[PDB]
């Protein structure tokens, strides 16, 4: 009978969860070792442990069919069993799983091993993306130098892994279908537990898109004045290499040349950080201080003992794209970041420490619940703090921003600077997964794969390669997440919902009142707020124990993902910018790019 079975099932889950945590710890350790120190030996070790865990998961998924779990009374037990049926890549036959893992490490290690030659010195060929190439892309205003580094990087990080990427798509699709999803797109989307999730995002993106187009138009206008019309056209897509970022995903590095009021203050605390002798250690300690100030959890000793917070100085290869790691025991959580002393990096630190906080908050949950309410929730946590960290209010408090007068013009500068990060990124984030979804779904013929990438980047972001590309090139894997098979929709979700969290935390902190000119949303600091911390504790402690609308409700009483809060934040910018574009007769929109030959 079912009553006796459900009692037995509860006991089964309790034991299995603990076993899965312990086994995942072993896999995670091998993965950590590889990412910290890329060698053939560590690759082999990483992949063989995973093959072993995959085999164990196969038996787990099989064993779930012996339980009448869909018949149970307990929603909680049913939810746990459903999680256990989700094999993902582990559904693949033994040999196919091994080949997929070999394919994934080939791509990630290619990306991590990219070195290019100095633009001025063709014999100095040890320049890595992090930090050498990214430093040029962010600081250089020599358009030909920028174009050189763009071409060198994309050729090496993208084109070199076309064959591997093709095999990856094949095996991703096979895995998805073995789980009875149509493709890897539906597999990814399953994480959001909502059959209208794509439409919901389209609707929100459509509401914010006009604001993006104003920002795009104004930026293009200002770039024309800086570089001249031979480099930037009025009516064409923006050459992406001028936007201060290798993927043009965020444009804040060119704020000094595109800011609304060049004679009024523009926040850039990097120089002050260096002057005051800031170190990566100090930056992480400050992040820790922020969380504890909100009555949230202090970083445990294991974090300080085991983390890598600086790029190693030996000869070794490693992945420098920052990462936060949960080892599924108690208090064993780590970051690996190749930390630099900059304002932008200060944000990355808080962003990554948001993951660590999430790990600690839900570590008491059953193994299957020890993850985010949805992938977007995990990415949002640290960004809510970074929003506060970025305010003139907070930066003055900590002594990094000096002699700042917050008049109307400085406010517009700060709003525009934030938008160069937060609004600009939305079409970018959407295209990363629209591209991969279309490949997963079999909607693009292999002969059209590269220009299908650039077509999306054009349609949505209005940017283009600095040079003519073709199907001889393969540019998508030049983005880390694409080489490393990390879903990107999480970030689109995050950038929307982080404003819902931020607005609510700010209200709870007494830091925001729409009817009070002294408390604007764009100058809210939640540092020290126990009330904001209480909301985070309520939501984060839940892990994945309930569907994500329940986790949002626990934070602020709402159940719906909404673009209202992000629009509210930027409304004063929208009003000013619409008027400023009209004032300057700024052309809005772009013609179809000529930069990918079919």
């Amino acid at each position: 009978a079912l009553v006796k079975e459900e009692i037995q099932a509860k006991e089964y889950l309790e034991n299995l969860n603990k076993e899965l945590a312990k086994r995942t710890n072993v896999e995670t350790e091998a993965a950590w070792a590889y990412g910290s120190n890329i060698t053939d030996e560590n690759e082999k070790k990483k992949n063989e442990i995973s093959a072993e865990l995959a085999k164990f998961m196969k038996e787990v998924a099989s064993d779930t069919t012996k339980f009448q779990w869909r018949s149970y009374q307990s929603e909680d037990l049913k939810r746990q069993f459903k999680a256990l049926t989700k094999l993902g890549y582990a559904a693949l036959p033994e040999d196919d799983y091994a080949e997929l893992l070999d394919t994934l490490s080939a791509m990630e290690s290619n990306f991590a091993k990219v070195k290019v030659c100095d633009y001025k010195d063709s014999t100095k060929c040890d320049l890595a993306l992090d930090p050498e190439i990214e430093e040029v892309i962010s600081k250089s205003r020599d358009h030909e130098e920028l174009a050189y580094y763009w071409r060198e990087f994309y050729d090496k990080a993208g084109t070199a892994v076309r064959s591997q990427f093709e095999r990856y798509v094949e095996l991703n699709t096979k895995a998805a279908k073995l789980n009875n999803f149509t493709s890897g797109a539906e597999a990814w989307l399953d994480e959001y537990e909502d059959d209208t999730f794509e439409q919901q995002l389209e609707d929100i993106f459509a509401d914010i898109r006009p604001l993006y187009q104003q920002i795009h138009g104004y930026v293009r206008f200002r770039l024309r004045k800086h570089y001249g019309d031979a480099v930037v056209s009025e009516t064409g897509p923006i050459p992406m290499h001028l936007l201060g970022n290798m993927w043009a995903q965020q444009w804040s590095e060119i704020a000094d040349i595109v800011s609304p009021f060049p004679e009024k203050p523009l926040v850039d605390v990097s120089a002050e950080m260096e002057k005051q002798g800031y170190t990566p250690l100090k930056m992480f300690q400050m992040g820790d201080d922020f969380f504890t100030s909100m009555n949230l959890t202090k970083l445990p000793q294991d974090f300080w003992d085991k983390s890598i917070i600086e790029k190693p100085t030996d000869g070794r290869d490693l992945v420098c794209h920052a990462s936060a790691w949960d080892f599924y025991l108690t208090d064993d959580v780590r970051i690996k970041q190749c930390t630099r002393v900059t304002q932008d990096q200060l944000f990355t630190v808080h962003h990554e420490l948001g993951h660590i906080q999430y790990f600690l908050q839900y570590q008491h949950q059953p193994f299957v619940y020890r993850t985010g309410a949805n992938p977007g929730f995990h990415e949002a946590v640290g960004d809510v703090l970074s929003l506060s960290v970025s305010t003139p209010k907070h930066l003055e408090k900590i002594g990094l921003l000096k002699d700042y007068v917050r008049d109307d013009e400085a406010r517009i500068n700060q709003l525009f600077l934030t938008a160069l990060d937060k609004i600009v990124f939305l079409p970018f984030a959407f295209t990363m997964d629209k591209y991969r979804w279309s490949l997963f779904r079999g909607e693009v013929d292999k002969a059209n794969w590269n220009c299908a990438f650039w077509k999306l980047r054009d349609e949505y972001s209005g940017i283009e390669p600095p040079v003519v590309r073709s199907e001889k090139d393969f540019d998508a894997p030049a983005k880390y997440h694409i080489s490393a098979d990390v879903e990107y929709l999480r970030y689109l979700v995050s950038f929307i919902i982080q404003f819902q969290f931020y607005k609510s935390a700010c209200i709870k902190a007494g830091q925001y009142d729409p009817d009070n000119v002294e408390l604007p949303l764009d100058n809210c600091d939640i540092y020290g707020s126990a009330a904001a911390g209480a909301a985070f504790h309520n939501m984060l402690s839940m892990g994945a124990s309930k569907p994500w609308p329940d986790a949002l409700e626990a934070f602020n009483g709402e159940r719906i993902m909404s673009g209202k809060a992000i629009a509210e934040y930027f409304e004063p910018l929208r009003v000013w910018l619409e008027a400023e574009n009209i004032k300057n007769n700024v052309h809005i929109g772009w013609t179809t790019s000529n930069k990918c030959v079919s």
């Binding site: 794209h321 936060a324 790691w325 690996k336 990554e352 880390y480 997440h481």
Partner: peptide, 6 residues
């Protein structure tokens, strides 16, 4: 898997 910046 590890959680990473955009």
């Amino acid at each position: 898997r590890p959680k990473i910046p955009p």
